[PDB]
Amino acid sequence: MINVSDLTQKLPEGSNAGVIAKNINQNQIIADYNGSTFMLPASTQKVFTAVAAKLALGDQFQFETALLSNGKIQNGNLDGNLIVSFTGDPDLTRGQLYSLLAELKKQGIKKINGDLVLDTSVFSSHDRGLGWIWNDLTMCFNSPPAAANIDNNCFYAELDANKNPGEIVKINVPAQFPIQVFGQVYVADSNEAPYCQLDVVVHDNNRYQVKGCLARQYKPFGLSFAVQNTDAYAAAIIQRQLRKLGIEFNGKVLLPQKPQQGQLLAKHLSKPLPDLLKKMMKKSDNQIADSLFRAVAFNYYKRPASFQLGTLAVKSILQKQGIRFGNSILADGSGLSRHNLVAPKTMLSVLEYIAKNEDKLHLMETFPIAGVDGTISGRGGLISPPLVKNVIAKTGSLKGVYNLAGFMTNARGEKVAFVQFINGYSTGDLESKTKRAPLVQFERNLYNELYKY
Amino acid sequence: MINVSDLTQKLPEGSNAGVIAKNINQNQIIADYNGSTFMLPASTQKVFTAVAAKLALGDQFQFETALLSNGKIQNGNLDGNLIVSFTGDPDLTRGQLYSLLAELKKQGIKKINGDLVLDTSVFSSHDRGLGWIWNDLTMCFNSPPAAANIDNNCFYAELDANKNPGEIVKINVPAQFPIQVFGQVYVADSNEAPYCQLDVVVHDNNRYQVKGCLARQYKPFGLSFAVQNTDAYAAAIIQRQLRKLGIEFNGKVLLPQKPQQGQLLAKHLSKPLPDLLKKMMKKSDNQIADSLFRAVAFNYYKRPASFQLGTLAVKSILQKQGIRFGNSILADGSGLSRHNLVAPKTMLSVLEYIAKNEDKLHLMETFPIAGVDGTISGRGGLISPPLVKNVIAKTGSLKGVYNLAGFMTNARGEKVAFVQFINGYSTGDLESKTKRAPLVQFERNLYNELYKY
Ligand SMILES: *C(=O)[C@@H](NC(=O)[C@H](N)c1ccccc1)[C@@H]1N[C@@H](C(=O)O)C(C)(C)S1
Ligand SMILES: *C(=O)[C@@H](NC(=O)[C@H](N)c1ccccc1)[C@@H]1N[C@@H](C(=O)O)C(C)(C)S1
């Protein structure tokens, strides 16, 4: 086998690598180093979700966002509640929801007599996985994969930090966002400036308290944040849209937990599963992965879906196909949880199942391609021949973690599946951009060795 | 050296162990397996904090909780504001605060004419470490180590779920706590129950919503909750205590966020450092660790202390004594953060520092003693001869993590220091009772080899 031990000499001191690789044609393991150690898979976890979704949802699967009502239309009035049904569409734009509501106009509803009711019942319990880190929850990459999801459940604020030390930075929220940003951030001089933290503390109803400081900067810029209460956000946006459409409403917003009985007025459908999976796999969209993860449970068990139900469903589905998990922990579909524990060999068995069943699953085309697209279009260790345009791989990255899982063609045109998990990688401290050079060098050498072996 | 690698065969598949030990009398390393690999130390991290606290705070250090004003007292009136200064005391009880406020009434004050002003300026930025897991933040073990801390910033509620399927569980909060617990949790039948989640959602101002369902219970279901807004909680306690003391107050509660000057009326002192360190080390008190961590930085740098300053101070203080951290990540004093990264050998160098300076530090007596006290009085791997009454060790545990760091006497009467980090330990799914038999056997074997080597 490849001497993976010698290769990890170039990784930073303290790090730990789990590396396993198999020549599928020869049915031979050609690298095996901590292949059985549980590690943090980060976003390589999305491979499991991709397979489960293919199998339990199918290529015709679409997320539906619907408008329903129990009552009768007449005189331009909807004589009852407007029910808005959200099922976790992670790719729903504000533009789409608007056209959806526009459908009420087209049917001559001039005004709604009753209350606005949101049906988010297909998801159950929290909209965050267990073991997610609290301070990342305001970052847009970590926006909640909730039933209601509008423009990725992210917003930005406009900041102007062009000021002398001690002065207050100006923060405005653009008029489209029903959010508050409150508190005060000051400009720090270049001394204290390397120390700066911007603190964001969440309060109810999408009110974000900022504190701390920032280094002077000349030009305005935007900071993005995740929406926290996605039901209030969604309801506030629908009410503004109804006004814009000139449909009249003066009811309250209700948020029941149970499916809402009704007559269907209109429906919007997302792109189907193959397009969602491709964006999830190429760009590594956390929210698509966690929505599919629970959509899989919802459809598979026919009951409202918690992340725990997602875990049960994904394992049960892949187990049906011969995959064995032992005591792996799969707390989410995106890989964000710090409780996830998976060994390289388990990820590898899934990659083999993917390559074996490619005629059916067509998942190979979803993987980023070295030097070409997705999250590895510029990956340093992969950017030269013989690896460029040859290595395809799902990436996973968290603080301390640099992973790759996928396939390549060796110098004999045989296929090699491989999993690389690197954890404990640290070359400065909390809030030091990480020196990636030893990683570029490890990966360049590793994939060349698997190429020639 | 000891063949640690064979001994890990008894640990669950997937787990990883970092073990290192030294015979101090011979100065020989006798076990060294993954000794340089960064791992999660969990509460063994508190060893670093004990040493930094001894060096920078000293045995006379006590936390101060104080009452100040600028008005003068005339004719039974405090003619200005009551300032209550909190500095992070992690062992302040509401009875102690009550006796402190009683002192006003011994100085003749029976009415306060102004406002209640809290000064919590000694600590700054969040009261939570970065990399803490969001869903544990409502649990009493994860109560915020804030400036204001009353009864461990934890309270108790009871759910009476001894009722039929379909009924709403009754929530009872004892009346001493100025908090609200509300929601509709229902009792689920035997069929639905395995799918239930009992959730809590935190709302502004210490309002807790419980949601979900649970199986019929056949005793009272206790909830133990962390206080989320510690300033509001403290101000509410103060106002009820003032009332109960017959001191009239009708002013506002102000939280200015900067140091508040005034004349000192009365000062409550905690128990001194050696008592705080003994409780932190014997029992593993998370709040005393994170309190001391930031008190250390406040006193060492003389400026409001965040967790980042805590990290800088602890490293700087120990670096002076010859400890080298390289690229370790210490995000807190308690080890709760999932970003913490430290190698067995760095912890061992601190243990050696501890044994070498025992005549001045007196920290040896703060470690738990196998089969005798603290968190290893009943630790199954250590409770037989020759380990019982001989091994002393600080424990660390999180989901997946089972650590010891401490000392023992071997068969020759020489002192051995050791560090055992186990991560990736999984014997079932997330919410499962973990199986400890593999841990008991691995530890019984490892400490026996270290005894015999
Ligand atoms: C999977 O690993 C995901 N990672 C994250 O969301 C991290 N929390 C993160 C790391 C760095 C920057 C922003 C978020 C997604 N996958 C990553 C990857 O494929 O390498 C990502 C950085 C593109 S986000
Ligand atoms: C340090 O390791 C601390 N651990 C925790 O607070 C964990 N979050 C936890 C694990 C299990 C149950 C409750 C909390 C403290 N140290 C532990 C130890 O010494 O083993 C602890 C369980 C006593 S709490």
Side-chain angles (χ1 to χ4, degrees), chain A residues 13-14 38 125-126 129 131-135 197 199 204 303 308 327 345 426 429, chain B residues 13-14 36 38 125 129 131-132 134-135 195 199 204 308 327 329 345 424 426 431:
Chain A
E13 206 200 322
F38 288 149
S125 179
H126 299 291
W132 290 14
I133 288 171
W134 74 269
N135 47 295
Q197 296 212 178
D199 291 349
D204 292 335
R303 50 184 322 124
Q308 287 57 57
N327 287 134
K345 70 186 196 192
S426 173
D429 47 295
Chain B
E13 204 185 344
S36 308
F38 287 143
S125 184
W132 293 7
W134 73 273
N135 47 287
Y195 307 104
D199 288 325
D204 288 355
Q308 295 47 70
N327 300 114
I329 299 297
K345 70 191 189 191
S426 185
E431 282 93 73

mmCIF file of all heavy atoms in Angstrom, chain A residues 13-14 38 125-126 129 131-135 197 199 204 303 308 327 345 426 429, chain B residues 13-14 36 38 125 129 131-132 134-135 195 199 204 308 327 329 345 424 426 431:
data_model
loop_
_atom_site.group_PDB
_atom_site.id
_atom_site.type_symbol
_atom_site.label_atom_id
_atom_site.label_comp_id
_atom_site.label_asym_id
_atom_site.label_seq_id
_atom_site.Cartn_x
_atom_site.Cartn_y
_atom_site.Cartn_z
ATOM 1 N N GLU A 13 2.051 19.586 12.823
ATOM 2 C CA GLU A 13 2.154 18.842 14.048
ATOM 3 C C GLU A 13 0.861 18.877 14.826
ATOM 4 O O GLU A 13 0.153 19.889 14.827
ATOM 5 C CB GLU A 13 3.305 19.359 14.898
ATOM 6 C CG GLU A 13 3.808 18.211 15.818
ATOM 7 C CD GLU A 13 4.620 18.709 17.052
ATOM 8 O OE1 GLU A 13 5.397 19.701 16.853
ATOM 9 O OE2 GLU A 13 4.480 18.102 18.184
ATOM 10 N N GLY A 14 0.496 17.748 15.425
ATOM 11 C CA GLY A 14 -0.788 17.633 16.139
ATOM 12 C C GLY A 14 -1.971 17.163 15.315
ATOM 13 O O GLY A 14 -2.993 16.765 15.890
ATOM 14 N N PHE A 38 -13.167 6.816 13.905
ATOM 15 C CA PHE A 38 -14.228 7.823 13.773
ATOM 16 C C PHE A 38 -13.604 9.215 13.693
ATOM 17 O O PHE A 38 -12.827 9.602 14.564
ATOM 18 C CB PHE A 38 -15.159 7.780 14.964
ATOM 19 C CG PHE A 38 -16.071 6.592 15.009
ATOM 20 C CD1 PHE A 38 -16.482 6.055 16.226
ATOM 21 C CD2 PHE A 38 -16.594 6.037 13.844
ATOM 22 C CE1 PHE A 38 -17.386 4.991 16.262
ATOM 23 C CE2 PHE A 38 -17.505 4.963 13.879
ATOM 24 C CZ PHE A 38 -17.876 4.413 15.079
ATOM 25 N N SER A 125 -39.671 19.574 15.757
ATOM 26 C CA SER A 125 -38.626 19.909 16.730
ATOM 27 C C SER A 125 -37.712 21.043 16.214
ATOM 28 O O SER A 125 -38.138 21.878 15.430
ATOM 29 C CB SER A 125 -37.872 18.618 17.122
ATOM 30 O OG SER A 125 -36.821 18.832 18.032
ATOM 31 N N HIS A 126 -36.465 21.116 16.632
ATOM 32 C CA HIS A 126 -35.663 22.301 16.259
ATOM 33 C C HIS A 126 -35.260 22.269 14.817
ATOM 34 O O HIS A 126 -35.223 21.206 14.252
ATOM 35 C CB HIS A 126 -34.350 22.272 17.040
ATOM 36 C CG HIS A 126 -34.548 22.321 18.514
ATOM 37 N ND1 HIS A 126 -35.011 23.455 19.151
ATOM 38 C CD2 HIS A 126 -34.326 21.396 19.481
ATOM 39 C CE1 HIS A 126 -35.057 23.238 20.458
ATOM 40 N NE2 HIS A 126 -34.644 21.995 20.684
ATOM 41 N N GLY A 129 -29.302 21.136 13.870
ATOM 42 C CA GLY A 129 -28.862 19.858 14.311
ATOM 43 C C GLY A 129 -28.299 19.943 15.747
ATOM 44 O O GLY A 129 -27.811 21.003 16.204
ATOM 45 N N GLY A 131 -25.337 19.517 18.322
ATOM 46 C CA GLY A 131 -23.875 19.480 18.275
ATOM 47 C C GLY A 131 -23.421 20.575 17.373
ATOM 48 O O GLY A 131 -22.196 20.729 17.115
ATOM 49 N N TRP A 132 -24.361 21.365 16.857
ATOM 50 C CA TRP A 132 -23.890 22.613 16.162
ATOM 51 C C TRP A 132 -23.386 23.648 17.136
ATOM 52 O O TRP A 132 -23.903 23.769 18.264
ATOM 53 C CB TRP A 132 -25.034 23.262 15.342
ATOM 54 C CG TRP A 132 -25.431 22.477 14.127
ATOM 55 C CD1 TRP A 132 -25.088 21.180 13.829
ATOM 56 C CD2 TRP A 132 -26.376 22.876 13.127
ATOM 57 N NE1 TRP A 132 -25.728 20.776 12.640
ATOM 58 C CE2 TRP A 132 -26.527 21.799 12.221
ATOM 59 C CE3 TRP A 132 -27.101 24.069 12.896
ATOM 60 C CZ2 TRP A 132 -27.359 21.884 11.069
ATOM 61 C CZ3 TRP A 132 -27.941 24.152 11.757
ATOM 62 C CH2 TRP A 132 -28.051 23.074 10.867
ATOM 63 N N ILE A 133 -22.414 24.424 16.713
ATOM 64 C CA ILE A 133 -21.778 25.398 17.574
ATOM 65 C C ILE A 133 -22.584 26.728 17.655
ATOM 66 O O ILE A 133 -23.051 27.289 16.627
ATOM 67 C CB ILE A 133 -20.361 25.598 17.074
ATOM 68 C CG1 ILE A 133 -19.523 24.357 17.402
ATOM 69 C CG2 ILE A 133 -19.718 26.735 17.762
ATOM 70 C CD1 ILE A 133 -18.221 24.443 16.741
ATOM 71 N N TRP A 134 -22.753 27.267 18.869
ATOM 72 C CA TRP A 134 -23.722 28.324 19.022
ATOM 73 C C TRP A 134 -23.238 29.576 18.287
ATOM 74 O O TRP A 134 -24.032 30.278 17.705
ATOM 75 C CB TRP A 134 -23.976 28.655 20.499
ATOM 76 C CG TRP A 134 -22.866 29.390 21.112
ATOM 77 C CD1 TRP A 134 -21.769 28.842 21.769
ATOM 78 C CD2 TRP A 134 -22.692 30.825 21.154
ATOM 79 N NE1 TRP A 134 -20.928 29.879 22.200
ATOM 80 C CE2 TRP A 134 -21.476 31.085 21.865
ATOM 81 C CE3 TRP A 134 -23.452 31.922 20.659
ATOM 82 C CZ2 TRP A 134 -20.978 32.389 22.077
ATOM 83 C CZ3 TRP A 134 -22.968 33.237 20.894
ATOM 84 C CH2 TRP A 134 -21.745 33.456 21.611
ATOM 85 N N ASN A 135 -21.943 29.848 18.290
ATOM 86 C CA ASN A 135 -21.553 31.162 17.814
ATOM 87 C C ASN A 135 -21.578 31.214 16.288
ATOM 88 O O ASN A 135 -21.455 32.282 15.757
ATOM 89 C CB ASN A 135 -20.184 31.608 18.358
ATOM 90 C CG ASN A 135 -19.130 30.524 18.243
ATOM 91 O OD1 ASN A 135 -19.234 29.486 18.869
ATOM 92 N ND2 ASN A 135 -18.119 30.759 17.446
ATOM 93 N N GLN A 197 -13.034 41.670 17.925
ATOM 94 C CA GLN A 197 -14.138 40.780 17.659
ATOM 95 C C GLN A 197 -15.381 41.658 17.468
ATOM 96 O O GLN A 197 -15.609 42.628 18.198
ATOM 97 C CB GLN A 197 -14.398 39.817 18.840
ATOM 98 C CG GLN A 197 -13.290 38.809 19.185
ATOM 99 C CD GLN A 197 -13.856 37.442 19.763
ATOM 100 O OE1 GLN A 197 -13.079 36.513 20.061
ATOM 101 N NE2 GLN A 197 -15.210 37.335 19.900
ATOM 102 N N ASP A 199 -19.194 40.976 18.009
ATOM 103 C CA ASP A 199 -20.099 40.080 18.701
ATOM 104 C C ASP A 199 -21.482 40.286 18.155
ATOM 105 O O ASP A 199 -21.907 41.434 17.957
ATOM 106 C CB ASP A 199 -20.160 40.428 20.200
ATOM 107 C CG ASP A 199 -18.845 40.097 20.948
ATOM 108 O OD1 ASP A 199 -17.972 39.410 20.331
ATOM 109 O OD2 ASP A 199 -18.743 40.489 22.154
ATOM 110 N N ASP A 204 -35.258 37.880 20.487
ATOM 111 C CA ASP A 204 -36.437 37.329 19.761
ATOM 112 C C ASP A 204 -36.780 38.209 18.581
ATOM 113 O O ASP A 204 -36.406 39.403 18.558
ATOM 114 C CB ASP A 204 -37.676 37.316 20.620
ATOM 115 C CG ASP A 204 -37.576 36.323 21.769
ATOM 116 O OD1 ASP A 204 -36.828 35.368 21.661
ATOM 117 O OD2 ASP A 204 -38.311 36.489 22.733
ATOM 118 N N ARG A 303 -44.313 10.973 8.587
ATOM 119 C CA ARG A 303 -44.598 11.717 9.831
ATOM 120 C C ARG A 303 -43.703 12.960 9.874
ATOM 121 O O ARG A 303 -42.642 13.008 9.214
ATOM 122 C CB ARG A 303 -44.326 10.846 11.075
ATOM 123 C CG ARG A 303 -42.961 10.205 11.013
ATOM 124 C CD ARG A 303 -42.752 9.275 12.192
ATOM 125 N NE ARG A 303 -43.374 9.911 13.326
ATOM 126 C CZ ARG A 303 -44.308 9.339 14.070
ATOM 127 N NH1 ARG A 303 -44.653 8.070 13.842
ATOM 128 N NH2 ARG A 303 -44.851 10.016 15.063
ATOM 129 N N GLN A 308 -33.432 13.988 14.338
ATOM 130 C CA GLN A 308 -33.263 12.606 14.846
ATOM 131 C C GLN A 308 -33.971 11.641 13.920
ATOM 132 O O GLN A 308 -33.441 10.565 13.600
ATOM 133 C CB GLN A 308 -33.803 12.488 16.314
ATOM 134 C CG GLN A 308 -32.833 13.191 17.356
ATOM 135 C CD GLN A 308 -32.606 14.667 16.998
ATOM 136 O OE1 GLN A 308 -33.590 15.467 16.892
ATOM 137 N NE2 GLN A 308 -31.321 15.015 16.687
ATOM 138 N N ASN A 327 -21.398 2.067 15.101
ATOM 139 C CA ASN A 327 -21.885 3.047 16.010
ATOM 140 C C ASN A 327 -21.552 4.506 15.540
ATOM 141 O O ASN A 327 -21.331 5.409 16.395
ATOM 142 C CB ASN A 327 -21.222 2.746 17.351
ATOM 143 C CG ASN A 327 -21.795 1.511 17.985
ATOM 144 O OD1 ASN A 327 -21.064 0.637 18.476
ATOM 145 N ND2 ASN A 327 -23.098 1.417 17.967
ATOM 146 N N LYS A 345 -13.495 4.330 6.219
ATOM 147 C CA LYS A 345 -13.977 3.141 5.472
ATOM 148 C C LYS A 345 -15.460 3.124 5.289
ATOM 149 O O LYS A 345 -16.020 2.527 4.305
ATOM 150 C CB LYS A 345 -13.503 1.836 6.156
ATOM 151 C CG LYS A 345 -14.181 1.578 7.469
ATOM 152 C CD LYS A 345 -13.561 0.325 8.199
ATOM 153 C CE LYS A 345 -14.537 -0.100 9.293
ATOM 154 N NZ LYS A 345 -13.810 -1.068 10.135
ATOM 155 N N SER A 426 -4.068 22.701 12.930
ATOM 156 C CA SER A 426 -4.020 23.995 13.578
ATOM 157 C C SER A 426 -2.626 24.576 13.365
ATOM 158 O O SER A 426 -1.639 23.944 13.700
ATOM 159 C CB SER A 426 -4.296 23.847 15.083
ATOM 160 O OG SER A 426 -4.103 25.080 15.760
ATOM 161 N N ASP A 429 -4.188 29.980 15.907
ATOM 162 C CA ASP A 429 -5.158 29.951 17.081
ATOM 163 C C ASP A 429 -6.621 30.258 16.637
ATOM 164 O O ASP A 429 -6.862 30.358 15.426
ATOM 165 C CB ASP A 429 -4.740 30.925 18.198
ATOM 166 C CG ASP A 429 -4.372 32.318 17.655
ATOM 167 O OD1 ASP A 429 -3.360 32.410 16.912
ATOM 168 O OD2 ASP A 429 -5.096 33.307 17.967
ATOM 169 N N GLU B 13 -14.796 0.028 18.867
ATOM 170 C CA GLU B 13 -14.302 0.342 17.545
ATOM 171 C C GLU B 13 -14.520 1.809 17.146
ATOM 172 O O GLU B 13 -15.607 2.380 17.423
ATOM 173 C CB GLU B 13 -15.018 -0.548 16.506
ATOM 174 C CG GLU B 13 -14.074 -0.602 15.346
ATOM 175 C CD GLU B 13 -14.600 -1.351 14.106
ATOM 176 O OE1 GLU B 13 -15.615 -2.132 14.188
ATOM 177 O OE2 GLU B 13 -13.936 -1.114 13.072
ATOM 178 N N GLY B 14 -13.537 2.419 16.499
ATOM 179 C CA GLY B 14 -13.674 3.841 16.102
ATOM 180 C C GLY B 14 -13.040 4.872 17.031
ATOM 181 O O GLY B 14 -12.664 5.957 16.596
ATOM 182 N N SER B 36 1.459 13.302 20.756
ATOM 183 C CA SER B 36 1.561 14.635 20.167
ATOM 184 C C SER B 36 0.334 15.013 19.401
ATOM 185 O O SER B 36 0.308 16.041 18.778
ATOM 186 C CB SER B 36 2.752 14.760 19.218
ATOM 187 O OG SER B 36 3.917 14.338 19.866
ATOM 188 N N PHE B 38 -3.276 16.482 18.714
ATOM 189 C CA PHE B 38 -4.260 17.398 19.383
ATOM 190 C C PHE B 38 -5.561 16.667 19.627
ATOM 191 O O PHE B 38 -6.073 16.063 18.701
ATOM 192 C CB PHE B 38 -4.582 18.603 18.475
ATOM 193 C CG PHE B 38 -3.468 19.614 18.370
ATOM 194 C CD1 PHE B 38 -3.200 20.282 17.154
ATOM 195 C CD2 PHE B 38 -2.683 19.910 19.486
ATOM 196 C CE1 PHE B 38 -2.227 21.211 17.111
ATOM 197 C CE2 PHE B 38 -1.694 20.856 19.397
ATOM 198 C CZ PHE B 38 -1.446 21.478 18.194
ATOM 199 N N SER B 125 -17.676 41.003 26.367
ATOM 200 C CA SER B 125 -18.020 40.127 25.244
ATOM 201 C C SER B 125 -18.923 39.020 25.795
ATOM 202 O O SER B 125 -19.590 39.206 26.869
ATOM 203 C CB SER B 125 -16.761 39.614 24.526
ATOM 204 O OG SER B 125 -17.111 38.828 23.349
ATOM 205 N N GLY B 129 -18.092 30.412 25.878
ATOM 206 C CA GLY B 129 -16.915 30.157 25.052
ATOM 207 C C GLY B 129 -17.364 29.894 23.591
ATOM 208 O O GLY B 129 -18.467 29.388 23.322
ATOM 209 N N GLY B 131 -17.319 27.815 20.314
ATOM 210 C CA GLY B 131 -17.190 26.383 20.040
ATOM 211 C C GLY B 131 -18.041 25.587 21.042
ATOM 212 O O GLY B 131 -18.032 24.370 20.988
ATOM 213 N N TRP B 132 -18.748 26.252 21.966
ATOM 214 C CA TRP B 132 -19.753 25.544 22.802
ATOM 215 C C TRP B 132 -20.967 25.138 21.958
ATOM 216 O O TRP B 132 -21.346 25.807 20.979
ATOM 217 C CB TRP B 132 -20.247 26.380 23.968
ATOM 218 C CG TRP B 132 -19.171 26.673 25.057
ATOM 219 C CD1 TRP B 132 -17.823 26.385 25.006
ATOM 220 C CD2 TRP B 132 -19.390 27.311 26.313
ATOM 221 N NE1 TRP B 132 -17.213 26.814 26.171
ATOM 222 C CE2 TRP B 132 -18.153 27.367 26.988
ATOM 223 C CE3 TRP B 132 -20.514 27.899 26.917
ATOM 224 C CZ2 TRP B 132 -18.022 27.966 28.261
ATOM 225 C CZ3 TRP B 132 -20.410 28.449 28.183
ATOM 226 C CH2 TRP B 132 -19.175 28.470 28.855
ATOM 227 N N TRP B 134 -24.832 24.518 20.884
ATOM 228 C CA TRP B 134 -25.923 25.422 21.190
ATOM 229 C C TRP B 134 -26.939 24.672 22.042
ATOM 230 O O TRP B 134 -27.571 25.266 22.931
ATOM 231 C CB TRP B 134 -26.594 25.961 19.901
ATOM 232 C CG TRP B 134 -27.401 24.941 19.240
ATOM 233 C CD1 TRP B 134 -26.939 24.007 18.312
ATOM 234 C CD2 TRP B 134 -28.758 24.633 19.472
ATOM 235 N NE1 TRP B 134 -27.946 23.157 17.977
ATOM 236 C CE2 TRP B 134 -29.086 23.529 18.629
ATOM 237 C CE3 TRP B 134 -29.767 25.192 20.268
ATOM 238 C CZ2 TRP B 134 -30.384 22.953 18.582
ATOM 239 C CZ3 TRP B 134 -31.090 24.578 20.240
ATOM 240 C CH2 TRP B 134 -31.364 23.502 19.394
ATOM 241 N N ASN B 135 -27.139 23.370 21.793
ATOM 242 C CA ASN B 135 -28.290 22.766 22.461
ATOM 243 C C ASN B 135 -28.036 22.420 23.930
ATOM 244 O O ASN B 135 -28.951 22.032 24.626
ATOM 245 C CB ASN B 135 -28.784 21.514 21.721
ATOM 246 C CG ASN B 135 -27.670 20.603 21.370
ATOM 247 O OD1 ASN B 135 -26.865 20.888 20.458
ATOM 248 N ND2 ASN B 135 -27.546 19.504 22.130
ATOM 249 N N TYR B 195 -40.926 8.339 19.017
ATOM 250 C CA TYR B 195 -40.656 9.466 18.105
ATOM 251 C C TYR B 195 -40.651 10.890 18.780
ATOM 252 O O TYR B 195 -40.337 11.902 18.124
ATOM 253 C CB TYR B 195 -41.660 9.471 16.958
ATOM 254 C CG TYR B 195 -41.746 8.155 16.211
ATOM 255 C CD1 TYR B 195 -42.832 7.284 16.421
ATOM 256 C CD2 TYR B 195 -40.758 7.775 15.292
ATOM 257 C CE1 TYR B 195 -42.923 6.064 15.747
ATOM 258 C CE2 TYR B 195 -40.848 6.556 14.598
ATOM 259 C CZ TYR B 195 -41.935 5.705 14.847
ATOM 260 O OH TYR B 195 -42.065 4.494 14.190
ATOM 261 N N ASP B 199 -38.562 19.473 23.785
ATOM 262 C CA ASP B 199 -37.626 20.595 23.478
ATOM 263 C C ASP B 199 -37.820 21.812 24.383
ATOM 264 O O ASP B 199 -38.893 21.981 24.962
ATOM 265 C CB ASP B 199 -37.781 21.038 22.052
ATOM 266 C CG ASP B 199 -37.202 19.999 21.066
ATOM 267 O OD1 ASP B 199 -36.166 19.340 21.409
ATOM 268 O OD2 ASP B 199 -37.779 19.847 19.966
ATOM 269 N N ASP B 204 -36.694 35.940 25.064
ATOM 270 C CA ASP B 204 -36.100 37.054 25.819
ATOM 271 C C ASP B 204 -36.516 37.056 27.307
ATOM 272 O O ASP B 204 -37.628 36.689 27.680
ATOM 273 C CB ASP B 204 -36.543 38.394 25.206
ATOM 274 C CG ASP B 204 -35.882 38.662 23.854
ATOM 275 O OD1 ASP B 204 -35.012 37.874 23.417
ATOM 276 O OD2 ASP B 204 -36.166 39.700 23.266
ATOM 277 N N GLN B 308 -11.409 35.424 25.018
ATOM 278 C CA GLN B 308 -10.127 35.586 24.287
ATOM 279 C C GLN B 308 -8.984 36.115 25.185
ATOM 280 O O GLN B 308 -7.860 35.652 25.166
ATOM 281 C CB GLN B 308 -10.319 36.543 23.076
ATOM 282 C CG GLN B 308 -11.237 36.006 22.016
ATOM 283 C CD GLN B 308 -12.571 35.427 22.554
ATOM 284 O OE1 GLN B 308 -13.461 36.164 23.046
ATOM 285 N NE2 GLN B 308 -12.690 34.065 22.477
ATOM 286 N N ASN B 327 0.734 25.164 18.739
ATOM 287 C CA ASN B 327 -0.524 25.679 18.201
ATOM 288 C C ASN B 327 -1.771 25.109 18.885
ATOM 289 O O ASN B 327 -2.815 25.027 18.257
ATOM 290 C CB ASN B 327 -0.592 25.418 16.646
ATOM 291 C CG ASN B 327 0.583 26.130 15.919
ATOM 292 O OD1 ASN B 327 1.490 25.493 15.335
ATOM 293 N ND2 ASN B 327 0.659 27.398 16.118
ATOM 294 N N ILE B 329 -5.222 24.922 20.947
ATOM 295 C CA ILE B 329 -6.273 25.892 21.045
ATOM 296 C C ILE B 329 -6.927 25.708 22.435
ATOM 297 O O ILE B 329 -7.455 24.632 22.742
ATOM 298 C CB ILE B 329 -7.384 25.648 19.994
ATOM 299 C CG1 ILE B 329 -6.929 25.718 18.472
ATOM 300 C CG2 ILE B 329 -8.584 26.492 20.323
ATOM 301 C CD1 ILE B 329 -6.418 27.024 18.014
ATOM 302 N N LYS B 345 0.899 15.313 25.609
ATOM 303 C CA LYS B 345 2.210 15.723 26.210
ATOM 304 C C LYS B 345 2.204 17.118 26.793
ATOM 305 O O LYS B 345 2.955 17.388 27.699
ATOM 306 C CB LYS B 345 3.360 15.656 25.179
ATOM 307 C CG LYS B 345 3.234 16.756 24.095
ATOM 308 C CD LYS B 345 4.256 16.476 22.929
ATOM 309 C CE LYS B 345 4.374 17.633 21.882
ATOM 310 N NZ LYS B 345 5.158 17.063 20.726
ATOM 311 N N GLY B 424 -13.895 10.128 20.177
ATOM 312 C CA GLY B 424 -14.518 9.215 19.253
ATOM 313 C C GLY B 424 -15.188 7.974 19.885
ATOM 314 O O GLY B 424 -15.370 6.986 19.186
ATOM 315 N N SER B 426 -18.050 5.747 21.022
ATOM 316 C CA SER B 426 -19.467 5.637 20.704
ATOM 317 C C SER B 426 -19.876 4.151 20.833
ATOM 318 O O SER B 426 -19.297 3.279 20.145
ATOM 319 C CB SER B 426 -19.684 6.070 19.232
ATOM 320 O OG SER B 426 -21.070 6.064 18.950
ATOM 321 N N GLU B 431 -28.632 9.894 21.571
ATOM 322 C CA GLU B 431 -29.417 10.032 22.810
ATOM 323 C C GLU B 431 -29.304 8.839 23.791
ATOM 324 O O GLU B 431 -29.909 8.860 24.868
ATOM 325 C CB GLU B 431 -30.897 10.329 22.490
ATOM 326 C CG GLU B 431 -31.170 11.784 22.094
ATOM 327 C CD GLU B 431 -31.110 12.013 20.582
ATOM 328 O OE1 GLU B 431 -32.062 11.557 19.906
ATOM 329 O OE2 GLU B 431 -30.137 12.648 20.082
#
